[PDB]
Amino acid sequence: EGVIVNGTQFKDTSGNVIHAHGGGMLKHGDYYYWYGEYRDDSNLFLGVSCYRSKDLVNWEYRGEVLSRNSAPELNHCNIERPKVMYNASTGEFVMWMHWENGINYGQARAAVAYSKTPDGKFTYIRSFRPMQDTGVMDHGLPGYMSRDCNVFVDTDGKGYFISAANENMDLHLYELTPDYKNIASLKAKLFVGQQREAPCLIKRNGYYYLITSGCTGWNPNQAKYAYSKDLASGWSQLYNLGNSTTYRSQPTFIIPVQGSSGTSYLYMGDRWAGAWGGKVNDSQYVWLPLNFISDTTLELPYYDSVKIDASSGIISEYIPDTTRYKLVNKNSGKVLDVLDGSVDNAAQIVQWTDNGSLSQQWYLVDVGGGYKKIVNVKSGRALDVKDESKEDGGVLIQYTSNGGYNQHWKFTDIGDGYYKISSRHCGKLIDVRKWSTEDGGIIQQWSDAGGTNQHWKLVLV
Numbered sequence: 001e002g003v004i005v006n007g008t009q010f011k012d013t014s015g016n017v018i019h020a021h022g023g024g025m026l027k028h029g030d031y032y033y034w035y036g037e038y039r040d041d042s043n044l045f046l047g048v049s050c051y052r053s054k055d056l057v058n059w060e061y062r063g064e065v066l067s068r069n070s071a072p073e074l075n076h077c078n079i080e081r082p083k084v085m086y087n088a089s090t091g092e093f094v095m096w097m098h099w100e101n102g103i104n105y106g107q108a109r110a111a112v113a114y115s116k117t118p119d120g121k122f123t124y125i126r127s128f129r130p131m132q133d134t135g136v137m138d139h140g141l142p143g144y145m146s147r148d149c150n151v152f153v154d155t156d157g158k159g160y161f162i163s164a165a166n167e168n169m170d171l172h173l174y175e176l177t178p179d180y181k182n183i184a185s186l187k188a189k190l191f192v193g194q195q196r197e198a199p200c201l202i203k204r205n206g207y208y209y210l211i212t213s214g215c216t217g218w219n220p221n222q223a224k225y226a227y228s229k230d231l232a233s234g235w236s237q238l239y240n241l242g243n244s245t246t247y248r249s250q251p252t253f254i255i256p257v258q259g260s261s262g263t264s265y266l267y268m269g270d271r272w273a274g275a276w277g278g279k280v281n282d283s284q285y286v287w288l289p290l291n292f293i294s295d296t297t298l299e300l301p302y303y304d305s306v307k308i309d310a311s312s313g314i315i316s317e318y319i320p321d322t323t324r325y326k327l328v329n330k331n332s333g334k335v336l337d338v339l340d341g342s343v344d345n346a347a348q349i350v351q352w353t354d355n356g357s358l359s360q361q362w363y364l365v366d367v368g369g370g371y372k373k374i375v376n377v378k379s380g381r382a383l384d385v386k387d388e389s390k391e392d393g394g395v396l397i398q399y400t401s402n403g404g405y406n407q408h409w410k411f412t413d414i415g416d417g418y419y420k421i422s423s424r425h426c427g428k429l430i431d432v433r434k435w436s437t438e439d440g441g442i443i444q445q446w447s448d449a450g451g452t453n454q455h456w457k458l459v460l461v
């Protein structure tokens, strides 16, 4: 039962609430290490916890790799977004983070630490504003500002540190020295004046991807991403990822989960309790699979429950009810199907002859109220009303699950095993266009006209 419940606070093997807010993760040896920070009673840096696991679901407490006692300036300060990266050359784990006074946010500087072991007590080095010696001034103080940050290890073995500079208006990608403990140069300035925060830098197939969020404090916002063949330049524009609130969370880190089957990228987020007036320690987590439609097209679906099998390297949706179904039209006798039995995103939904194919099988996931999710089997995508249309003739397609109301359907029994499937968005029924009785009939959205082409029978398979 390697299943995770989003919008909650995961508990370690001890039965205690895990506290690794704004943290990250590292895969070394046979274990996945989850680092993160958490405040205390005075809302100040208490320690950077570390959790270990092989299955990515059951986490074991390993103590504070970094404490407010590790250094004199760590006593009264704010530390957030601690990330850990490994150095093959040295053989030591270097840790970066964001440091503040604890009184204000004027000292926008980064901090560094390291240890010979992953779950061992890290030794604090220093806190500083990148390029301090260069003499450059960034808003009153010497050295570039450095708030929200993150680390990245490239294939060639070069380390990289990214953070928000120039009053969170610009993103600075710093290239680290071979030891990872220092900054060698300013690789490139990314997304100037666009004000992107909580950056996550990853790589897949010669393509670099940068997942960022907006700057609105606790308030969840529209997350975005970009791609490029080179870190220095060639970066694309910003493309929306997830919904308008990133499913009520803010991105913190993204790691490739490699296994026997293949590689599945995991998304980590934070549901900051500050949204509803709660303390930082009351923040919950949101883990979702990061799917790659193409080298240039990304998908971030929302599953209320996610199943993970680290061994095989597979991250998919958890269906509470594996019962398969077929939707037969009263008028045509055809069943609900996907065009060309495609698994592509936004694939057109059509009616087709009952051929017992996978494309013609659907799950029914309750999503609160009297509404449900109609999910295809051959492709984990959900039945969706294209472009959240509220008009007659609105085409129906299969789209990535995003909790939108245009993906919620209520079944209304009319007798004899037939139902009227209305959308939660406008209330229009699932309709076979023009009363079509042939294969490939476009499935659409239409007002309840009492037609038999709008009536569907639910059949077990």
Ligand SMILES: OC[C@H]1O[C@@H](O[C@H]2[C@@H](O)[C@@H](CO)O[C@@H](O[C@@H]3[C@@H](O)[C@H](O)O[C@H](CO)[C@@H]3O)[C@@H]2O)[C@H](O)[C@@H](O)[C@H]1O
Pocket: 345, 346, 384, 385, 386, 387, 388, 389, 399, 402, 404, 406
């Ligand atoms: O009014 C709100 C908002 O609605 C968006 O509708 C989008 C969503 O319904 C989304 C799933 O929730 O599905 C989008 O379908 C898009 C399609 O529009 C585009 O042409 O192709 C992509 C991928 O192929 C995808 O299928 C749908 O657009 C509107 O998009 C948005 O403008 C806004 O109106």
